[PDB]
Structures are given as structure tokens and as C-alpha cells.
Ligand SMILES: OC[C@H]1O[C@@H](O[C@H]2[C@H](O)[C@@H](O)[C@H](O)O[C@@H]2CO)[C@H](O)[C@@H](O)[C@H]1O
């Protein structure tokens with residue numbers, strides 16, 4: 001029922017990816033080279049009926065409880081787990097000044113992601129790309 005999308009970095013054209021296709025909670029979200037087709041499941045995302053981002057793989061939310069972002073089951077009363085599309089950024093629903101951010105602008109595949117104060121830099125710039 002939902003249409004899925006990639007979250008693609010303007011820093012290097014790599015996409016957000018649940019490391020190793022791991023459906024367990026606490027799996028790191030990293031940058032990785034884009035896959036197409038049935039194996040792309042851990043790079044595909046959608047927004048739920050309230051507009052909040054989830055993974056196609058396990059319907060988990062993005063979680064910024066730790067320095068590095070990871071997957072966790074969605075909890076509507078945990079502000080660290082509600083992330084939204086906001087123009088060319090992924091923003092924290094509860095604080096729009098906080099966006100997803102490729103740590104230290106690392107351009108290598110496998111880079112980790114953090115929640116950071118918005119500054120307009122290319123490491124905070126993401127394009128939503130329909131599957
Ligand atoms: O390492 C990030 C990368 O992992 C891929 O999954 C690999 C896994 O890393 C490897 O240990 C196993 O032998 O094969 C899997 C499939 O190639 C993910 O597919 C990819 O999306 C990234 O998350």
C-alpha cells in the first residue's frame with residue numbers, strides 16, 4: 001500500500017541502508033551504494049499514515065537515542081524516533097532544527113549518521129527518490 005523511496009545523499013549519491021540487511025533493533029543506519037530490485041529492501045523507506053518515516057524491512061523507525069542512528073520499533077511517545085521528510089533534509093519531528101547528518105561528512109560507503117543541528121552543509125542534504 002505505501003510507495004517506497006530511497007533516501008539519497010547529495011554528498012556522494014549513496015543511500016541510507018540498514019547495515020547487513022539486519023532486521024533486529026539497534027542495527028546501524030549507514031550510507032551504502034544503491035541497490036535496485038528485490039534485494040533493495042533494507043534501503044527502502046516509507047512514511048506511515050501520520051507522515052513518519054519507517055523502514056520497509058521491519059517497519060521500524062529511525063532512532064537517534066545514541067550518537068549513531070539505528071533502527072528501533074516506532075514509539076509515538078519517543079521524540080527520538082519520529083523523523084520526517086522536510087524538503088531536502090530528514091528532520092526530527094519534535095525539533096526541526098535537528099536533522100540527519102553524515103558524520104564528519106565522511107564520503108566513504110559505510111559512513112554512520114547522526115542527529116545534528118541544521119547548518120545547510122551537503123552532509124545534511126538528502127533527496128527522496130521513488131522506487
Ligand atoms: O556491509 C553493508 C552492506 O551489507 C550488505 O549485506 C551483506 C553483508 O554485509 C555480508 O556480510 C553478507 O555476506 O552478504 C550480505 C549481502 O551482500 C547489505 O546488502 C547492504 O545493503 C549493506 O548493508
Ligand SMILES: OC[C@H]1O[C@@H](O[C@H]2[C@H](O)[C@@H](O)[C@H](O)O[C@@H]2CO)[C@H](O)[C@@H](O)[C@H]1O
Nearest residue numbers: 101102103104105114116119121123124
Ligand atoms: O561530529 C559530527 C559533526 O562533524 C562535523 O565535521 C567536523 C568534524 O567533527 C571534525 O572532526 C573535523 O576536524 O572538522 C569537521 C568540519 O568542521 C560536521 O560538520 C557536522 O555536520 C557533524 O557531522
